Amino acid sequence: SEVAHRFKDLGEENFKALVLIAFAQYLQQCPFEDHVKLVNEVTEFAKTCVADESAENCDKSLHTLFGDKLCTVATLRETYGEMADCCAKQEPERNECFLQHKDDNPNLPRLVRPEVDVMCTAFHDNEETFLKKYLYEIARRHPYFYAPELLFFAKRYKAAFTECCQAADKAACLLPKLDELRDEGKASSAKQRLKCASLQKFGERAFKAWAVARLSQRFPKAEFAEVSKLVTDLTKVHTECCHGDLLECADDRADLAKYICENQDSISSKLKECCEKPLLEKSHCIAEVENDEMPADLPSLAADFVESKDVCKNYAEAKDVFLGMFLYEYARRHPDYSVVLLLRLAKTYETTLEKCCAAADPHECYAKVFDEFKPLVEEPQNLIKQNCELFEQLGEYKFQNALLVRYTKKVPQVSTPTLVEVSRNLGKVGSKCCKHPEAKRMPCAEDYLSVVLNQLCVLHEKTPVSDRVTKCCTESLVNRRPCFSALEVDETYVPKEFNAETFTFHADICTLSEKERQIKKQTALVELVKHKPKATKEQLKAVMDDFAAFVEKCCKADDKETCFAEEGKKLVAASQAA
Ligand SMILES: CC(C)c1cccc(C(C)C)c1O
Ligand SMILES: CC(C)c1cccc(C(C)C)c1O
């Protein structure tokens, strides 16, 4: 028995929670009730396997059990049409079918939230179904959410109500903590979506490279042999969580924290405080610890990597280990570099050793390698420096609007909603990183753009409309940013054509929050740039200036929200003029 295994390790709480998340992430459109049912039928079975370890099918692989359970509702194609197919499949992958069918953008209605007076009551009456509903909603809207981390977000979500419901001003104590969590959750989710895309679309060697750089940056004092161990394990953990195997991922993840904390003196000195607490908190801590201080007297890289005469020979012996050692050695002394830049230098070095080593005189050919690193390193520095300056003058909103115009011109085929969402997130880097010392600016900015751009890539892969996006997304994981910065204005795009249904105006806008108001304005700008790419400099503003006027007036005029229809057609006349 395996299901027996995981049960004993995670116990009832966690085991039950993880299974729900797994089920919710597979059948995102399936109602809460049904999921709870299967989860229970599923948990009950488990309990018997514990006692009798060969009873029904207790001898099974979680994949058959889980699969069959879901298939008791999936065969209902009138609800989940294309799902029934996966069910008719077999063992080798009646699952590859499921994972392949995950929606990164489910057509699930907005999740609005009941007055502080209800959530509190509902929470107190039944604390179980309240928290269960949380995970269900998150996991079903974020099919790649790092499961073990979702359990941590849950323990915090509970503590939010556990406390604020006992306030004097609940709405005051809650609202905050609830926002803060909604944001941090969308981040953790994007951070993880990139980790799964790497493994799934580029391979484990790719993820392994990213881990070596990252870990070496964080734990400079750690030895190469140690980092590899860590990289090996961490890779397996994420491979499982991304293959849909959450129970083993959670288990293995706990084992790693245990290890890392045990060999504390051998890895980092800033681990102490993470090793002193509740596991879930210990795991989230280690994963977010600050880099350790850099080892005092460190030799120069040129020594064993460009000046040694045995370079080519060692490369031939164990290239992967050699290049791994290079990356580890370069990253440990450069916490001021982003992880993609470090991977760019490593790829440039390998490429050089390849052509150089088959030469009539290596050491002569590869002897000036660091000369090619210069441009690679300066490029992001200049980009960061310049976009931060600009972001400072215009602020976040105006900056976002700049990227919006820019990016819609780059790839006009992309759907407006994605452009708006992506441009917004790109602008949010300014507030997030610009306020940092140049020593921490690049790692902050560039790696965050690797997450934001990945989101655009996974969202585009759904319905590919621009081969330029496909190319930049597929050609290189590490050069995605550089690829997109290089893109200019699509000279082959043909302007859209106005039609009524293009943009709808109903008064319903005057009720929405300040945010959804800007958003509707940004959605307008994108639609504008799609209809008038070229002609655009400052007619854009002049017009956007006009759109604001429209809303202001019509929302505060007291006619039926009629002017909306009349004046709606009025502005269109003006717009076209420009
Ligand atoms: C830090 C942040 C403001 C930033 C830096 C460099 C480049 C970009 C985009 C425009 C590619 C960016 O948003
Ligand atoms: C909302 C407003 C800015 C707008 C959007 C899309 C197209 C047009 C014209 C070109 C018809 C337009 O004026």
UniProtKB/Swiss-Prot annotation:
Q: Mutating E350K: what's the consequence?
A: In Hiroshima-1
Question: What residues does the record give for site: Not glycated?
Answer: 16, 37, 60, 69, 89, 102, 132, 155, 170, 177, 186, 191, 201, 208, 236, 258, 270, 282, 355, 368, 385, 398, 410, 428, 432, 462, 471, 496, 515, 520, 534, 537, 553, 556, 560, 570
Instruction: Name the organs or tissues of expression.
Output: Plasma.
Associated condition reads:
Hyperthyroxinemia, familial dysalbuminemic: A disorder characterized by abnormally elevated levels of total serum thyroxine (T4) in euthyroid patients. It is due to abnormal serum albumin that binds T4 with enhanced affinity. Analbuminemia: A rare autosomal recessive disorder manifested by the presence of a very low amount of circulating serum albumin. Affected individuals manifest mild edema, hypotension, fatigue, and, occasionally, lower body lipodystrophy (mainly in adult females). The most common biochemical finding is hyperlipidemia, with a significant increase in the total and LDL cholesterol concentrations, but normal concentrations of HDL cholesterol and triglycerides.
Query: How the protein is affected by changing E354K?
Result: In Coari I/Porto Alegre
Residues bearing glycans: 8, 47, 133, 158, 195, 221, 229, 272, 277, 309, 313-314, 319, 347, 374, 409, 435, 440, 490, 521, 530, 532, 541, 569
Report if keyword Metal-binding is assigned: yes
Provide the protein's localization.
Answer: Secreted
GO terms under cellular component: blood microparticle; cytoplasm; endoplasmic reticulum; endoplasmic reticulum lumen; extracellular exosome; extracellular region; extracellular space; Golgi apparatus
Q: Which residues form the Albumin domain?
A: 1-182, 183-375, 376-573
Query: Sites of the modification Phosphothreonine?
Result: T79, T416, T418
Main subcellular localisation: secreted
**List-wise, which residues carry N6-succinyllysine?**
K201, K432, K515, K560
Q: Where is this site: Aspirin-acetylated lysine?
A: K195
Name the source organism: Homo sapiens (Human)
Upon changing D59N, the result is: In Malmo-95/Dalakarlia
Say yes or no: keyword Hydrolase present. Answer: no
Q: Name one GO biological process term.
A: cellular response to starvation
Protein name as annotated: Albumin
Q: Please tell me where Ca(2+) 1 binds in this chain.
A: E2, E240, D245, E248
Q: What is the recorded function of this protein according to its Swiss-Prot or TrEMBL entry?
A: Binds water, Ca(2+), Na(+), K(+), fatty acids, hormones, bilirubin and drugs. Its main function is the regulation of the colloidal osmotic pressure of blood. Major zinc transporter in plasma, typically binds about 80% of all plasma zinc. Major calcium and magnesium transporter in plasma, binds approximately 45% of circulating calcium and magnesium in plasma. Potentially has more than two calcium-binding sites and might additionally bind calcium in a non-specific manner.
Outcome reported for the amino acid change (mutating K569E): In Gent/Milano Fast
Q: Which family does it belong to?
A: Belongs to the ALB/AFP/VDB family.
